[PDB]
Amino acid sequence: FVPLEVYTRHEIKDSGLLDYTEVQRRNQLHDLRFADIDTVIHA
Amino acid sequence: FVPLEVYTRHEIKDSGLLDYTEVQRRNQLHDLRFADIDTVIHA
Amino acid sequence: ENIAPYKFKATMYYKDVTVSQVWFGHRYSQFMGIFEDRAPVPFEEVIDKINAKGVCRSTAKYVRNNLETTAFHRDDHETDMELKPANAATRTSRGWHTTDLKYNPSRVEAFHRYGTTVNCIVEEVDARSVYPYDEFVLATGDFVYMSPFYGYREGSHTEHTTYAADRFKQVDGFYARDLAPTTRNLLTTPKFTVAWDWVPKRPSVCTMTKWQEVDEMLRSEYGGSFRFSSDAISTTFTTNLTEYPLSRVDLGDCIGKDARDAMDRIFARRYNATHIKVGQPQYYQANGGFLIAYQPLLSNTVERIKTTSSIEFARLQFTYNHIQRHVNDMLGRVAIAWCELQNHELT
Amino acid sequence: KINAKGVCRSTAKYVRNNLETTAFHRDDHETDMELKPANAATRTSRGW
Amino acid sequence: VERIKTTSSIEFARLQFTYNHIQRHVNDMLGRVAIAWCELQNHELT
Amino acid sequence: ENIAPYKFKATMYYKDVTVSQVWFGHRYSQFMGIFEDRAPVPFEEVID
């Protein structure tokens, strides 16, 4: 008997359109990726 | 035959890093827990 | 396969810079805008006044979005408020906040008045990370772009971070505040600070979970493949005859210790005076991705594995094999007795 | 006015974040607008 | 007063039913076979 | 039954209008507010 799944838990998780992990993981990279979080400017 | 699960639905739900329920349930307690939502100040 | 994420306590320190803008009108006062910001607290603050005296400044000095800004709570000069616990809630971990209200300007008629507010909040959550444990999450929905095990000692610098070294400092001999010396671990993300007790990765994490402890697991090589039948849990696994080298299992350190403890406990409880172990414990890889730790007995007389989500293949295998053994044995006895009957009736 | 006449004031008197504030819509004096249904959408419950 | 917890797999119970059904059948039939075999032996003794 | 959603590449174009408001004080400078907005780019911009 081979292991058999109509839907592996990976595709069951993927069935959702969005998910916190991916979604706001990317949404909070946004600042890091598209801006500097270390450079300090004074004038 | 004893009931057997490689992954109970609880650990399958827990496999995700985050989840709306926990995450923004806490995120909207934030105001209640860390501030007063009833006290009114006038001056 | 361990799909349970890594879990561990984590202390989140931030000051909610929540600046409000209010208008006072001819007859009544209304906002013009309220900005809220989550402000990090520098390492030195957490050490010297969060860990030592349980106080926090009324200023939140932090570089926000490529500019350094500090916020004087109360709109007055700097003052260190004694931290106090937040009000009660249902099954939320402990939290603490200096400020309890928000400051607002007193009414001055027909003028625009800006209102600042700093609530230096210390909150304990539990953090969650998943393989490759590249970055980890906290309950508040925020993120920390760095492995839980990144650091300095014992190859910790190898583990991934995504921050300049200035943001990531570590304390050796850290004395946890009464709010034993430890090794605390802090990162100043652009919003907050996260502190979790740094631990060495390989011992404290695993990609395989102890699933069952079969007290009696008969093993029988067959057709160039081992059969692991467990009458107790009603399952029959199948593996290749070659053992499974643990060095191939990534982060599989937990397997040896957990296995050893389980077989030792079971042997003491049930097989201390009836059998003797033969050879050190063996490890086989079963169909459906089930690493099996097998300890043979005798009477006194680098990769990642993927596990199926259905034991029912193996439970069918066990049921079918059990029924087949029975029916094959019984029909074989019937056929043998039938031959004997025929030869016997020949007389 | 919501349950009886289906109207609502142009002011929103509420204590926001430990301060009482009301907002005159239109930036004019208080007026009660007759509620009306929102524009159509797909499998969203009724809004107004 | 308590709360019960339910598994997520009927397959344990469906295996129980399948195995019990097949076992009832095979045990009954092999019992009939063994009984008839004894009767055959005692009968052939003559 | 296909429960795998439709997947395909997609290119997202926007300008993060992130307007900030700062105060410069007698001894040090602090914000008064930071608004961020995601702004569409007209078709002609993407093309040309």
Side-chain angles (χ1 to χ4, degrees):
Chain A
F1 292 75
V2 297
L4 207 50
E5 303 172 88
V6 59
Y7 295 112
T8 62
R9 57 180 166 79
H10 288 75
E11 46 188 348
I12 290 184
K13 180 190 178 180
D14 177 64
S15 84
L17 274 296
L18 300 168
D19 187 7
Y20 262 119
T21 53
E22 290 82 352
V23 166
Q24 62 159 294
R25 188 258 166 182
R26 188 190 204 91
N27 214 37
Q28 293 180 35
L29 276 296
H30 178 88
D31 189 358
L32 172 62
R33 291 175 60 219
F34 301 153
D36 186 314
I37 59 192
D38 303 323
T39 301
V40 184
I41 298 85
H42 64 287
Chain B
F1 292 75
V2 297
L4 207 50
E5 303 172 88
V6 59
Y7 295 112
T8 62
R9 57 180 166 79
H10 288 75
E11 46 188 348
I12 290 184
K13 180 190 178 180
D14 177 64
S15 84
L17 274 296
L18 300 168
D19 187 7
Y20 262 119
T21 53
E22 290 82 352
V23 166
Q24 62 159 294
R25 188 258 166 182
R26 188 190 204 91
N27 214 37
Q28 293 180 35
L29 276 296
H30 178 88
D31 189 358
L32 172 62
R33 291 175 60 219
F34 301 153
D36 186 314
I37 59 192
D38 303 323
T39 301
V40 184
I41 298 84
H42 64 287
Chain C
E1 172 193 329
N2 181 7
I3 63 154
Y6 182 36
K7 288 162 266 195
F8 55 95
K9 294 312 311 303
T11 317
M12 172 166 318
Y13 318 82
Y14 55 94
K15 315 191 188 188
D16 286 332
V17 176
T18 300
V19 63
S20 56
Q21 186 173 2
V22 176
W23 200 18
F24 311 125
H26 61 91
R27 269 272 64 70
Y28 183 76
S29 166
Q30 152 197 23
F31 290 105
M32 294 182 286
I34 293 170
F35 181 75
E36 63 90 19
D37 184 12
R38 279 170 42 199
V41 290
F43 203 81
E44 61 84 19
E45 199 165 2
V46 174
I47 301 303
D48 308 330
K49 65 179 72 66
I50 307 304
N51 191 2
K53 268 75 73 175
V55 302
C56 190
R57 313 161 150 280
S58 53
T59 199
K61 188 175 190 297
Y62 64 111
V63 162
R64 172 76 275 156
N65 212 357
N66 306 57
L67 181 161
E68 61 276 61
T69 193
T70 192
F72 303 170
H73 174 47
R74 180 74 271 173
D75 207 359
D76 288 345
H77 42 57
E78 168 44 58
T79 187
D80 286 28
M81 280 136 289
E82 311 264 19
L83 179 149
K84 60 167 297 317
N87 66 15
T90 178
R91 45 73 170 171
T92 72
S93 296
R94 284 201 301 310
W96 299 268
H97 66 86
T98 64
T99 316
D100 51 353
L101 311 180
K102 90 169 178 76
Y103 157 82
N104 293 314
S106 173
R107 175 172 186 190
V108 62
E109 194 268 358
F111 291 164
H112 296 349
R113 276 297 95 182
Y114 44 86
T116 67
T117 298
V118 171
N119 189 358
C120 177
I121 297 177
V122 174
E123 153 176 4
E124 293 179 353
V125 304
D126 52 328
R128 308 173 58 72
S129 70
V130 75
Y131 185 107
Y133 316 99
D134 200 2
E135 62 192 3
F136 73 94
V137 310
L138 293 85
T140 68
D142 62 358
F143 291 100
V144 170
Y145 290 159
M146 182 179 72
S147 175
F149 324 104
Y150 179 54
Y152 308 128
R153 288 197 270 89
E154 184 178 1
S156 315
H157 54 287
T158 300
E159 278 314 322
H160 165 103
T161 185
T162 301
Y163 295 98
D166 55 352
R167 311 294 286 275
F168 174 84
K169 299 289 94 176
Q170 193 175 342
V171 179
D172 271 332
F174 182 90
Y175 171 79
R177 179 46 187 290
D178 300 327
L179 187 65
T182 57
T183 179
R184 198 65 158 169
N185 189 358
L186 280 74
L187 183 63
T188 62
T189 67
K191 304 288 182 65
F192 50 90
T193 45
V194 169
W196 68 112
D197 297 2
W198 176 98
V199 298
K201 170 183 188 176
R202 296 196 57 76
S204 310
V205 68
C206 197
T207 53
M208 304 278 318
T209 291
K210 184 203 321 283
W211 173 48
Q212 282 293 26
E213 281 174 31
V214 177
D215 291 331
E216 168 147 39
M217 176 81 106
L218 308 197
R219 183 262 295 277
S220 57
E221 176 188 312
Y222 205 47
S225 303
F226 282 118
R227 263 81 164 179
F228 284 61
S229 83
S230 162
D231 193 287
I233 78 175
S234 173
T235 302
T236 294
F237 303 89
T238 293
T239 77
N240 290 308
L241 300 192
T242 303
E243 294 188 359
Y244 205 68
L246 272 299
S247 60
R248 186 183 322 179
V249 165
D250 201 316
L251 288 166
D253 306 312
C254 79
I255 307 165
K257 322 145 192 168
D258 294 317
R260 201 156 322 286
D261 296 337
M263 283 74 75
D264 294 332
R265 155 171 52 259
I266 289 167
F267 195 76
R269 171 168 62 73
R270 176 171 193 180
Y271 308 84
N272 67 347
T274 309
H275 307 264
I276 188 66
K277 305 188 185 181
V278 174
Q280 72 90 2
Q282 307 169 297
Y283 299 82
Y284 309 81
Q285 196 268 354
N287 310 124
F290 288 97
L291 182 51
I292 298 190
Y294 190 51
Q295 175 47 74
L297 292 195
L298 176 48
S299 82
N300 292 320
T301 308
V302 54
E303 68 180 1
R304 146 168 275 174
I305 189 170
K306 305 201 88 61
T307 298
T308 183
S309 301
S310 174
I311 301 299
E312 322 309 339
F313 90 93
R315 302 202 87 177
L316 294 174
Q317 179 70 241
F318 165 75
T319 284
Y320 177 85
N321 277 15
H322 195 49
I323 287 173
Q324 168 205 35
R325 297 285 75 78
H326 174 236
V327 301
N328 281 354
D329 180 24
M330 296 297 172
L331 294 195
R333 293 192 208 193
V334 164
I336 284 174
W338 187 271
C339 287
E340 281 181 342
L341 189 64
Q342 294 330 286
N343 305 348
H344 195 70
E345 295 292 328
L346 193 151
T347 304
Chain D
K1 65 179 72 66
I2 307 304
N3 191 2
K5 268 76 73 175
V7 302
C8 190
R9 313 161 150 280
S10 53
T11 198
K13 188 175 190 297
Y14 65 111
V15 162
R16 172 76 275 156
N17 212 357
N18 306 57
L19 181 161
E20 61 276 61
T21 193
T22 192
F24 303 170
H25 174 47
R26 180 74 271 173
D27 207 359
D28 288 345
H29 42 57
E30 169 44 58
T31 187
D32 286 29
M33 280 136 289
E34 311 264 19
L35 179 149
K36 60 167 297 317
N39 66 15
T42 178
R43 45 73 170 171
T44 72
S45 296
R46 284 201 301 310
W48 299 268
Chain E
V1 54
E2 68 180 1
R3 146 168 275 174
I4 189 170
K5 305 201 89 61
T6 298
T7 183
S8 301
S9 174
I10 301 299
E11 322 309 339
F12 90 93
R14 302 202 87 177
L15 294 174
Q16 179 70 61
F17 165 75
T18 284
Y19 177 85
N20 277 15
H21 195 49
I22 287 173
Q23 168 205 35
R24 297 285 75 78
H25 174 236
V26 301
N27 281 354
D28 180 24
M29 296 297 172
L30 294 195
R32 293 192 208 193
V33 164
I35 285 175
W37 187 271
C38 287
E39 281 181 342
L40 189 64
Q41 294 330 286
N42 305 348
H43 195 70
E44 295 292 328
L45 193 151
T46 304
Chain F
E1 172 193 329
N2 181 7
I3 63 154
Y6 182 36
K7 288 162 266 195
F8 55 95
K9 294 312 311 303
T11 317
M12 172 166 318
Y13 318 82
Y14 55 94
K15 315 191 188 188
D16 286 332
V17 176
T18 300
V19 63
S20 56
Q21 186 173 2
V22 176
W23 200 18
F24 311 125
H26 61 91
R27 269 272 64 70
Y28 184 77
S29 166
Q30 152 197 23
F31 290 105
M32 294 182 286
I34 293 170
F35 181 75
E36 63 90 19
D37 184 12
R38 279 170 42 199
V41 290
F43 203 81
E44 61 84 19
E45 199 165 3
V46 175
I47 301 303
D48 308 330

